[PDB]
Amino acid sequence: MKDEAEKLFNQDVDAAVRGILRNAKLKPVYDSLDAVRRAALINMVFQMGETGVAGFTNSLRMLQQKRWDEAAVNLAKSRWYNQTPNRAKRVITTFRTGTWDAYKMDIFEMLRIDEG
Ligand SMILES: [Cl-]
């Protein structure tokens, strides 16, 4: 099994939320979202880091405007998606729908699945 040093840490979850709040490229879209779509954003920041997610300007813009389909289509074109497509497809469904369909849940259990 995984080393204890390599497991999911609640504090790293909290670091992702802090990172969102203190980045003007992230907090406005987070604030605009419902709780389930917020979990998708937390996941993405947890995985690739604050700076990286803040680079997704076009797609976050779409999310902030409730343009769910356009956001999902755009996110699936990224290098991120092609790197980790199973995970990205789950996160994208969560952004698109505001449901846990892709995990059938809460942010911790979502990450517990995605981190493996
Ligand atoms: Cl994957």
Side-chain angles (χ1 to χ4, degrees), residues 14-32 41 45 48-57 60 64:
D14 294 352
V17 173
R18 290 184 285 266
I20 288 163
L21 295 172
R22 262 64 76 174
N23 192 310
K25 290 169 181 178
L26 301 177
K27 178 195 128 246
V29 62
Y30 178 84
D31 286 343
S32 79
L41 188 64
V45 172
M48 81 173 38
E50 171 193 346
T51 298
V53 181
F56 283 75
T57 309
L60 294 179
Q64 190 172 187

Coordinates of all heavy atoms in Angstrom, one line a residue, residues 14-32 41 45 48-57 60 64:
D14 N -7.4 21.6 2.7 CA -7.5 23.0 3.2 C -6.6 23.9 2.4 O -7.0 25.1 2.2 CB -7.3 23.0 4.7 CG -8.3 22.3 5.5 OD1 -9.3 21.8 4.9 OD2 -8.1 22.1 6.7
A15 N -5.4 23.5 2.1 CA -4.5 24.3 1.3 C -5.1 24.7 -0.1 O -4.9 25.8 -0.6 CB -3.1 23.7 1.1
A16 N -5.8 23.7 -0.7 CA -6.4 24.0 -2.0 C -7.5 25.0 -1.8 O -7.6 26.0 -2.6 CB -7.0 22.7 -2.5
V17 N -8.3 24.9 -0.8 CA -9.4 25.9 -0.5 C -8.7 27.3 -0.3 O -9.2 28.3 -0.9 CB -10.3 25.5 0.6 CG1 -11.3 26.7 1.0 CG2 -11.0 24.2 0.3
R18 N -7.7 27.4 0.6 CA -7.0 28.7 0.8 C -6.5 29.2 -0.5 O -6.5 30.4 -0.7 CB -5.8 28.5 1.8 CG -6.3 28.2 3.2 CD -5.1 28.1 4.2 NE -4.2 27.0 4.1 CZ -4.3 25.9 4.9 NH1 -5.3 25.8 5.8 NH2 -3.5 24.9 4.7
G19 N -5.9 28.4 -1.3 CA -5.3 28.8 -2.6 C -6.3 29.4 -3.5 O -6.1 30.5 -4.1
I20 N -7.5 28.8 -3.5 CA -8.6 29.4 -4.3 C -9.0 30.8 -3.7 O -9.1 31.8 -4.5 CB -9.9 28.5 -4.2 CG1 -9.6 27.3 -5.1 CG2 -11.2 29.2 -4.6 CD1 -10.5 26.1 -4.8
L21 N -9.2 30.9 -2.4 CA -9.7 32.1 -1.8 C -8.8 33.3 -2.0 O -9.2 34.4 -2.2 CB -10.0 31.9 -0.3 CG -11.1 31.0 0.0 CD1 -11.2 30.7 1.5 CD2 -12.5 31.5 -0.6
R22 N -7.5 33.0 -2.0 CA -6.5 34.1 -2.0 C -5.9 34.3 -3.5 O -5.0 35.1 -3.6 CB -5.4 33.9 -0.9 CG -5.6 34.8 0.3 CD -6.8 34.5 1.1 NE -6.6 33.3 1.9 CZ -7.5 32.8 2.7 NH1 -8.7 33.4 2.9 NH2 -7.2 31.7 3.4
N23 N -6.6 33.8 -4.5 CA -6.2 34.0 -5.9 C -7.4 34.6 -6.6 O -8.5 34.0 -6.8 CB -5.8 32.7 -6.5 CG -5.1 32.9 -7.9 OD1 -5.6 33.7 -8.7 ND2 -4.0 32.4 -8.0
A24 N -7.3 35.9 -7.1 CA -8.4 36.6 -7.8 C -8.8 35.9 -9.1 O -9.9 36.3 -9.6 CB -8.0 38.0 -8.0
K25 N -8.0 35.0 -9.6 CA -8.4 34.3 -10.8 C -9.3 33.1 -10.4 O -9.8 32.5 -11.3 CB -7.1 33.8 -11.5 CG -6.4 35.0 -12.2 CD -5.1 34.6 -12.7 CE -4.4 35.8 -13.3 NZ -3.0 35.4 -13.8
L26 N -9.4 32.7 -9.2 CA -10.1 31.5 -8.7 C -11.3 31.8 -7.7 O -12.3 31.2 -7.9 CB -9.1 30.6 -7.9 CG -7.9 30.1 -8.8 CD1 -7.0 29.2 -7.9 CD2 -8.4 29.3 -10.0
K27 N -11.1 32.7 -6.8 CA -12.2 33.0 -5.8 C -13.5 33.4 -6.5 O -14.5 33.0 -6.1 CB -11.7 34.0 -4.8 CG -12.7 34.4 -3.7 CD -12.2 35.7 -3.0 CE -13.1 36.9 -2.9 NZ -12.9 38.2 -3.5
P28 N -13.4 34.3 -7.5 CA -14.8 34.7 -8.0 C -15.5 33.5 -8.6 O -16.7 33.4 -8.4 CB -14.4 35.8 -9.1 CG -13.1 36.4 -8.5 CD -12.4 35.1 -8.1
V29 N -14.9 32.6 -9.4 CA -15.6 31.5 -9.9 C -16.0 30.6 -8.8 O -17.1 30.1 -8.8 CB -14.8 30.8 -11.1 CG1 -13.5 30.2 -10.7 CG2 -15.7 29.7 -11.7
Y30 N -15.2 30.3 -7.8 CA -15.5 29.5 -6.7 C -16.8 30.0 -6.0 O -17.8 29.3 -5.8 CB -14.4 29.4 -5.6 CG -14.7 28.6 -4.4 CD1 -14.6 27.3 -4.3 CD2 -15.1 29.3 -3.2 CE1 -14.8 26.6 -3.1 CE2 -15.4 28.6 -2.1 CZ -15.3 27.2 -2.0 OH -15.6 26.6 -0.8
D31 N -16.8 31.3 -5.7 CA -17.9 32.0 -5.0 C -19.2 31.8 -5.8 O -20.3 31.6 -5.2 CB -17.6 33.4 -4.8 CG -16.6 33.8 -3.7 OD1 -16.4 32.9 -2.9 OD2 -16.2 35.0 -3.7
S32 N -19.1 31.9 -7.1 CA -20.3 31.8 -8.0 C -20.9 30.4 -8.0 O -22.1 30.3 -8.4 CB -19.9 32.2 -9.4 OG -19.3 31.2 -10.2
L41 N -13.8 22.2 -8.4 CA -12.7 23.2 -8.4 C -11.7 22.9 -7.4 O -10.5 23.0 -7.6 CB -13.3 24.6 -8.3 CG -12.3 25.7 -8.5 CD1 -11.7 25.7 -9.9 CD2 -12.9 27.0 -8.2
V45 N -7.7 22.1 -8.1 CA -6.6 22.9 -7.4 C -5.7 21.9 -6.6 O -4.5 22.1 -6.5 CB -7.2 24.0 -6.6 CG1 -6.1 24.7 -5.7 CG2 -7.8 25.0 -7.5
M48 N -3.5 19.9 -9.4 CA -2.5 20.5 -10.2 C -1.9 21.8 -9.6 O -1.0 22.3 -10.2 CB -3.0 20.8 -11.6 CG -3.8 22.0 -11.7 SD -4.4 22.5 -13.3 CE -4.7 21.0 -14.0
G49 N -2.4 22.3 -8.4 CA -2.0 23.5 -7.8 C -2.7 24.7 -8.2 O -3.3 24.8 -9.3
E50 N -2.7 25.7 -7.3 CA -3.4 26.9 -7.5 C -2.9 27.6 -8.8 O -3.8 28.1 -9.6 CB -3.0 27.8 -6.3 CG -3.3 29.3 -6.4 CD -2.7 30.1 -5.4 OE1 -2.2 29.6 -4.4 OE2 -2.8 31.3 -5.5
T51 N -1.6 27.8 -9.0 CA -1.1 28.5 -10.1 C -1.6 27.9 -11.4 O -1.9 28.6 -12.4 CB 0.5 28.6 -10.1 OG1 0.8 29.3 -8.9 CG2 1.0 29.3 -11.2
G52 N -1.5 26.5 -11.5 CA -2.0 25.8 -12.7 C -3.4 26.1 -13.0 O -3.8 26.4 -14.1
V53 N -4.3 25.9 -12.0 CA -5.7 26.1 -12.3 C -6.0 27.5 -12.7 O -6.9 27.8 -13.5 CB -6.6 25.6 -11.1 CG1 -8.1 25.8 -11.4 CG2 -6.3 24.2 -10.8
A54 N -5.3 28.5 -12.1 CA -5.5 29.9 -12.4 C -5.2 30.2 -13.9 O -5.6 31.3 -14.4 CB -4.8 30.8 -11.5
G55 N -4.5 29.3 -14.5 CA -4.3 29.4 -16.0 C -5.4 29.0 -16.9 O -5.3 29.3 -18.1
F56 N -6.5 28.4 -16.3 CA -7.6 28.0 -17.2 C -8.6 29.1 -17.4 O -9.8 28.9 -17.0 CB -8.2 26.7 -16.6 CG -7.4 25.5 -16.8 CD1 -6.2 25.2 -16.0 CD2 -7.8 24.5 -17.7 CE1 -5.5 24.1 -16.3 CE2 -7.1 23.4 -17.9 CZ -5.9 23.2 -17.3
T57 N -8.2 30.2 -18.0 CA -9.0 31.4 -17.9 C -10.3 31.3 -18.6 O -11.4 31.7 -18.2 CB -8.2 32.6 -18.5 OG1 -6.9 32.5 -17.9 CG2 -8.9 33.9 -18.3
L60 N -12.7 28.7 -16.8 CA -13.3 29.2 -15.5 C -14.4 30.3 -15.8 O -15.4 30.3 -15.2 CB -12.2 29.7 -14.7 CG -11.2 28.6 -14.2 CD1 -10.1 29.3 -13.4 CD2 -11.8 27.6 -13.3
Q64 N -18.1 30.5 -14.5 CA -18.6 31.6 -13.8 C -20.0 32.1 -14.4 O -20.8 32.7 -13.6 CB -17.5 32.7 -13.8 CG -17.8 33.9 -12.9 CD -16.6 34.8 -12.8 OE1 -16.6 35.7 -12.0 NE2 -15.6 34.6 -13.6

